[PDB]
Amino acid sequence: LNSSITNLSGQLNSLQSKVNSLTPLVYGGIIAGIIGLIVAIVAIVLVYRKIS
Amino acid sequence: LNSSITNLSGQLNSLQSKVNSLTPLVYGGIIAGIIGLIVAIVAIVLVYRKIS
């Protein structure tokens, strides 16, 4: 049982490590999709005002 | 073995808050990035359309 729990705590620790190595990666990654949305939007706007 | 179980549960609960604050936010980030990509691709065509 003891071996079972030790390895188990171990896997949790480990998956928190995947998610916390992921933490700055997924934030930067959100931050690139959101600037993409806004920079795309401000460029469409500026082309759309002069075609219309 | 008891104290280790209570700590496992604690750490699990922490990490479940973490990933449940991730999964919507990361979806929203991904939604914003694909939409930004739509807007940008449609901007490409409209600058291409208006020079022609």
XYZ file of C-alpha atoms in Angstrom:
104
model
C 0.000 0.000 0.000
C 2.800 2.268 0.961
C 4.629 1.750 -2.318
C 1.229 2.355 -4.041
C 0.710 5.695 -2.358
C 4.273 6.802 -2.767
C 4.197 6.260 -6.548
C 0.689 7.750 -6.668
C 1.785 11.089 -4.878
C 4.617 10.917 -7.321
C 2.357 10.881 -10.367
C 0.241 13.799 -8.996
C 3.441 15.880 -8.386
C 4.542 15.012 -11.779
C 1.133 16.047 -13.554
C 1.255 19.356 -11.528
C 4.788 19.733 -13.074
C 3.350 19.126 -16.576
C 0.669 21.702 -15.903
C 3.245 24.240 -14.384
C 5.719 23.872 -17.205
C 2.603 24.401 -19.304
C 1.534 27.447 -17.234
C 3.815 30.136 -18.918
C 3.557 28.210 -22.223
C -0.304 28.195 -22.281
C -0.381 31.876 -21.137
C 1.992 33.087 -23.848
C 0.004 30.906 -26.188
C -3.267 32.587 -25.142
C -1.560 35.908 -25.367
C -0.526 35.187 -29.114
C -4.126 34.112 -30.101
C -5.577 37.257 -28.410
C -3.108 39.846 -29.985
C -3.779 37.952 -33.273
C -7.560 38.686 -32.813
C -6.991 42.366 -32.050
C -4.332 43.060 -34.691
C -6.421 41.268 -37.272
C -9.546 43.276 -36.191
C -7.849 46.680 -36.330
C -6.479 45.901 -39.861
C -9.845 44.633 -41.194
C -11.393 47.834 -39.804
C -8.950 50.058 -41.512
C -9.352 48.236 -44.844
C -13.196 48.009 -44.427
C -13.632 51.750 -43.870
C -11.961 52.624 -47.188
C -13.632 49.756 -49.381
C -16.998 50.964 -47.977
C -0.342 6.388 5.666
C -3.261 8.615 6.822
C -1.289 11.925 6.767
C 0.006 11.068 3.298
C -3.487 10.392 2.018
C -4.904 13.680 3.421
C -1.866 15.575 1.758
C -2.517 13.688 -1.597
C -6.133 14.808 -1.539
C -5.078 18.365 -0.740
C -2.680 18.562 -3.579
C -5.162 16.935 -5.919
C -7.917 19.532 -5.060
C -5.330 22.401 -5.631
C -4.451 20.991 -9.010
C -8.176 20.334 -9.949
C -8.854 24.125 -9.235
C -5.851 24.881 -11.401
C -6.918 22.804 -14.419
C -10.580 23.859 -14.089
C -9.375 27.571 -14.149
C -7.296 26.463 -17.256
C -9.800 24.481 -19.398
C -12.291 27.290 -20.024
C -9.580 29.946 -20.331
C -7.456 27.966 -22.564
C -10.564 27.147 -24.801
C -11.331 30.938 -24.904
C -7.733 31.626 -25.873
C -7.817 29.054 -28.609
C -11.247 30.453 -29.840
C -9.844 33.895 -29.912
C -6.738 32.677 -31.922
C -8.797 30.739 -34.646
C -11.175 33.761 -35.007
C -8.167 36.114 -35.235
C -6.829 33.817 -38.020
C -10.252 34.010 -39.801
C -10.235 37.835 -39.608
C -6.658 38.104 -40.762
C -7.227 35.666 -43.758
C -10.323 37.589 -44.717
C -8.212 40.787 -44.422
C -5.644 39.336 -46.883
C -8.325 38.717 -49.452
C -9.883 42.176 -49.029
C -6.549 44.126 -49.468
C -6.035 41.699 -52.546
C -9.521 42.411 -53.745
C -9.255 46.299 -53.421
C -5.881 46.559 -55.290
C -7.379 44.646 -58.132
